[PDB]
Amino acid sequence: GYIEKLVQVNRVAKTVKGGRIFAFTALTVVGDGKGRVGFGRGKAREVPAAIQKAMEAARRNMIQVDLNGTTLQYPTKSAHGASKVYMQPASEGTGIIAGGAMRAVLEVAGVQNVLAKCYGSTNPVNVVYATFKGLKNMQAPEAVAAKRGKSVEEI
RNA sequence: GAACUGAAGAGUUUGAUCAUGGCUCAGAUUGAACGCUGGCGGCAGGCCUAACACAUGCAAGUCGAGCGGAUGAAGGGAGCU
């Protein structure tokens, strides 16, 4: 029941005494499609081995994002290493308006109605980190009331 | 009651990477022009340049119930008929 999406497949290389060796790196994002999400990387000599190594690595590193329900709660901005990302909640109906690098993350994480924009560098590995940090730091209203020691009357 | 609901990125420096950084593209539009093609209708638009020169025809006339003269009928009377 885990929906898996491929963000990118990249061909990296290193040089040795005589010629070069080719390695394929793939980064994928996994999640239940409602409340769970996880991303991982994997390097292997071949693409069928490469995309697979990312699979277990993604499923082993997942969190619990606290969505408002079919959408995100509050407009937030998250950054990780010269990759700035802004995401804003949207009303029912509008699709996933986000870059293809992060569009997989929101769509897999269960978000279906959101407005997002990438600022700064658009490296797919780093933007995935940025949106992940924003989604992880997401706070539902009852949690904020617990921090301030009040009811949901703070709204 | 409504006058708002709104934001995508990609390619390209390297053996390969991250960043910075420029270039190019995917969009909307036009009083548009060119090429290929071409059935109709509604609505609209149509010298953006030489405020260059203009043939031709019209685009500012009207009032006789303001005024003077001319043209001077209908209708009647006469030579001839």
From Swiss-Prot:
Molecular-function GO term, any one: rRNA binding
Keywords: Acetylation, Ribonucleoprotein, Ribosomal protein, RNA-binding, rRNA-binding
GO terms for cellular component: cytosolic small ribosomal subunit
Statement: the UniProt record of this protein carries the keyword Ribosomal protein: yes
GO process terms (BP): translation
Residue ranges of domain S5 DRBM in the record: 2-65
NCBIfam families attached to this UniProt entry: rpsE_bact (TIGR01021)
Family (UniProt): Belongs to the universal ribosomal protein uS5 family.
Free-text comment on this protein's domains from its UniProt entry: The N-terminal domain interacts with the head of the 30S subunit; the C-terminal domain interacts with the body and contacts protein S4. The interaction surface between S4 and S5 is involved in control of translational fidelity.
Function in brief: With S4 and S12 plays an important role in translational accuracy.
Record's subunit section: Part of the 30S ribosomal subunit. Contacts proteins S4 and S8.
Protein name as it appears in the record: Small ribosomal subunit protein uS5
Annotated source species: Pseudomonas aeruginosa (strain ATCC 15692 / DSM 22644 / CIP 104116 / JCM 14847 / LMG 12228 / 1C / PRS 101 / PAO1)
Taxonomic classification: Bacteria, Pseudomonadati, Pseudomonadota, Gammaproteobacteria, Pseudomonadales
